[PDB]
Short mmCIF file of all heavy atoms in Angstrom, two decimals:
data_model
loop_
_atom_site.label_atom_id
_atom_site.label_comp_id
_atom_site.label_asym_id
_atom_site.label_seq_id
_atom_site.Cartn_x
_atom_site.Cartn_y
_atom_site.Cartn_z
N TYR A 42 94.94 111.86 88.71
CA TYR A 42 94.77 111.69 90.15
C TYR A 42 95.50 110.46 90.69
O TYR A 42 95.53 110.23 91.90
CB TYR A 42 93.29 111.66 90.50
CG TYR A 42 92.65 113.01 90.29
CD1 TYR A 42 91.84 113.25 89.19
CD2 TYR A 42 92.89 114.04 91.19
CE1 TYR A 42 91.27 114.50 89.00
CE2 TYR A 42 92.33 115.28 91.01
CZ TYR A 42 91.52 115.51 89.91
OH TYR A 42 90.97 116.75 89.75
N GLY A 43 96.08 109.66 89.80
CA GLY A 43 96.90 108.54 90.22
C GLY A 43 96.14 107.36 90.81
O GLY A 43 96.58 106.77 91.79
N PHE A 44 95.00 107.02 90.23
CA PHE A 44 94.30 105.81 90.64
C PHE A 44 93.43 105.29 89.52
O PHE A 44 93.09 106.03 88.59
CB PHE A 44 93.49 106.01 91.92
CG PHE A 44 92.22 106.81 91.74
CD1 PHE A 44 90.99 106.18 91.62
CD2 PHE A 44 92.27 108.19 91.73
CE1 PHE A 44 89.83 106.92 91.48
CE2 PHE A 44 91.11 108.93 91.59
CZ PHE A 44 89.88 108.30 91.46
N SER A 45 93.06 104.02 89.62
CA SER A 45 92.14 103.42 88.67
C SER A 45 91.02 102.71 89.42
O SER A 45 91.16 102.41 90.61
CB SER A 45 92.85 102.45 87.73
OG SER A 45 93.42 101.38 88.46
N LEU A 46 89.93 102.46 88.72
CA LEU A 46 88.75 101.87 89.34
C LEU A 46 88.34 100.57 88.66
O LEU A 46 88.62 100.35 87.48
CB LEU A 46 87.57 102.84 89.30
CG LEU A 46 87.73 104.13 90.10
CD1 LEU A 46 86.48 104.97 89.98
CD2 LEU A 46 88.05 103.82 91.56
N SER A 47 87.68 99.72 89.44
CA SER A 47 87.02 98.54 88.91
C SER A 47 85.56 98.61 89.32
O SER A 47 85.21 99.28 90.29
CB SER A 47 87.68 97.28 89.45
OG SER A 47 87.72 97.29 90.87
N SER A 48 84.72 97.90 88.59
CA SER A 48 83.29 97.99 88.80
C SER A 48 82.69 96.59 88.90
O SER A 48 83.19 95.66 88.28
CB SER A 48 82.64 98.74 87.65
OG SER A 48 81.24 98.84 87.82
N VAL A 49 81.63 96.46 89.68
CA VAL A 49 80.93 95.19 89.80
C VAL A 49 79.47 95.48 90.12
O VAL A 49 79.15 96.43 90.82
CB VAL A 49 81.57 94.30 90.89
CG1 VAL A 49 81.54 94.99 92.25
CG2 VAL A 49 80.89 92.93 90.94
N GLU A 50 78.62 94.67 89.51
CA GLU A 50 77.19 94.73 89.72
C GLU A 50 76.73 93.31 89.96
O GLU A 50 76.12 92.68 89.09
CB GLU A 50 76.49 95.32 88.49
N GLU A 51 77.08 92.78 91.13
CA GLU A 51 76.59 91.45 91.50
C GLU A 51 75.40 91.43 92.46
O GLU A 51 74.67 90.45 92.51
CB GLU A 51 77.74 90.60 92.06
N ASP A 52 75.20 92.51 93.22
CA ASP A 52 74.18 92.50 94.27
C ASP A 52 72.97 93.41 94.02
O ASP A 52 72.15 93.62 94.92
CB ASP A 52 74.80 92.81 95.64
CG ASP A 52 75.43 94.19 95.71
OD1 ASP A 52 75.26 94.99 94.77
OD2 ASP A 52 76.09 94.49 96.72
N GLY A 53 72.84 93.94 92.81
CA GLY A 53 71.71 94.79 92.47
C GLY A 53 72.04 96.27 92.45
O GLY A 53 71.22 97.09 92.04
N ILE A 54 73.25 96.61 92.89
CA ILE A 54 73.73 97.98 92.85
C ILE A 54 75.11 97.96 92.20
O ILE A 54 75.93 97.09 92.51
CB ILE A 54 73.85 98.58 94.27
CG1 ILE A 54 72.51 98.50 94.99
CG2 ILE A 54 74.34 100.02 94.20
CD1 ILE A 54 72.56 99.00 96.42
N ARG A 55 75.37 98.89 91.28
CA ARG A 55 76.72 99.00 90.74
C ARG A 55 77.63 99.59 91.80
O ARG A 55 77.32 100.61 92.41
CB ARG A 55 76.79 99.85 89.47
CG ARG A 55 78.17 99.79 88.79
CD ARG A 55 79.14 100.85 89.31
NE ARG A 55 79.03 102.10 88.56
CZ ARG A 55 79.64 102.32 87.40
NH1 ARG A 55 80.41 101.39 86.86
NH2 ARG A 55 79.48 103.49 86.78
N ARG A 56 78.76 98.92 92.02
CA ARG A 56 79.75 99.39 92.97
C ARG A 56 81.07 99.66 92.27
O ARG A 56 81.40 99.01 91.28
CB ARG A 56 79.95 98.36 94.09
CG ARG A 56 78.71 98.17 94.93
CD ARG A 56 78.94 97.19 96.07
NE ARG A 56 77.70 96.88 96.77
CZ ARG A 56 77.17 97.63 97.73
NH1 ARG A 56 77.78 98.74 98.11
NH2 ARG A 56 76.04 97.27 98.31
N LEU A 57 81.80 100.63 92.80
CA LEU A 57 83.13 100.97 92.29
C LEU A 57 84.16 100.74 93.38
O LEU A 57 83.92 101.08 94.54
CB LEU A 57 83.17 102.44 91.88
CG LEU A 57 82.38 102.81 90.63
CD1 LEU A 57 82.31 104.32 90.49
CD2 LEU A 57 83.01 102.19 89.40
N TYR A 58 85.30 100.16 93.01
CA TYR A 58 86.40 99.94 93.95
C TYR A 58 87.68 100.49 93.37
O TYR A 58 87.85 100.52 92.15
CB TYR A 58 86.57 98.45 94.24
CG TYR A 58 85.43 97.84 95.01
CD1 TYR A 58 84.32 97.33 94.35
CD2 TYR A 58 85.46 97.78 96.40
CE1 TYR A 58 83.28 96.76 95.06
CE2 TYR A 58 84.43 97.20 97.11
CZ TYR A 58 83.34 96.70 96.44
OH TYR A 58 82.30 96.13 97.14
N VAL A 59 88.58 100.90 94.25
CA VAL A 59 89.89 101.35 93.84
C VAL A 59 90.75 100.14 93.46
O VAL A 59 91.05 99.29 94.30
CB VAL A 59 90.59 102.16 94.94
CG1 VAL A 59 91.94 102.62 94.47
CG2 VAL A 59 89.73 103.36 95.32
N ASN A 60 91.11 100.10 92.18
CA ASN A 60 91.85 99.02 91.55
C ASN A 60 93.33 99.12 91.91
O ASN A 60 93.98 98.11 92.20
CB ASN A 60 91.64 99.11 90.03
CG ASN A 60 92.39 98.06 89.24
OD1 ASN A 60 92.14 96.86 89.38
ND2 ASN A 60 93.28 98.50 88.36
N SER A 61 93.85 100.34 91.90
CA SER A 61 95.24 100.60 92.26
C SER A 61 95.45 102.09 92.50
O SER A 61 94.68 102.92 92.01
CB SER A 61 96.18 100.13 91.16
OG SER A 61 96.07 100.95 90.01
N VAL A 62 96.48 102.42 93.27
CA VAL A 62 96.86 103.81 93.50
C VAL A 62 98.36 103.98 93.31
O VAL A 62 99.14 103.08 93.65
CB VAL A 62 96.45 104.35 94.89
CG1 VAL A 62 94.95 104.24 95.11
CG2 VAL A 62 97.22 103.65 96.00
N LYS A 63 98.75 105.13 92.77
CA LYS A 63 100.16 105.49 92.68
C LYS A 63 100.61 106.12 93.99
O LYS A 63 99.97 107.04 94.50
CB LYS A 63 100.37 106.46 91.52
CG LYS A 63 101.82 106.88 91.32
N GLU A 64 101.70 105.62 94.54
CA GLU A 64 102.18 106.07 95.85
C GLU A 64 102.44 107.57 95.91
O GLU A 64 102.19 108.21 96.93
CB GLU A 64 103.46 105.30 96.23
CG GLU A 64 104.02 105.67 97.59
N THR A 65 102.94 108.14 94.82
CA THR A 65 103.27 109.56 94.79
C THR A 65 102.13 110.39 94.21
O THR A 65 102.26 111.60 94.06
CB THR A 65 104.52 109.82 93.93
OG1 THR A 65 104.29 109.36 92.59
CG2 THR A 65 105.73 109.10 94.51
#
Side-chain angles (χ1 to χ4, degrees), residues 42-49 52-62 65:
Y42 291 104
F44 74 100
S45 62
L46 296 181
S47 55
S48 180
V49 59
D52 63 8
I54 303 177
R55 188 271 271 277
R56 295 183 188 277
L57 290 170
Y58 293 88
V59 181
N60 179 63
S61 70
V62 302
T65 59

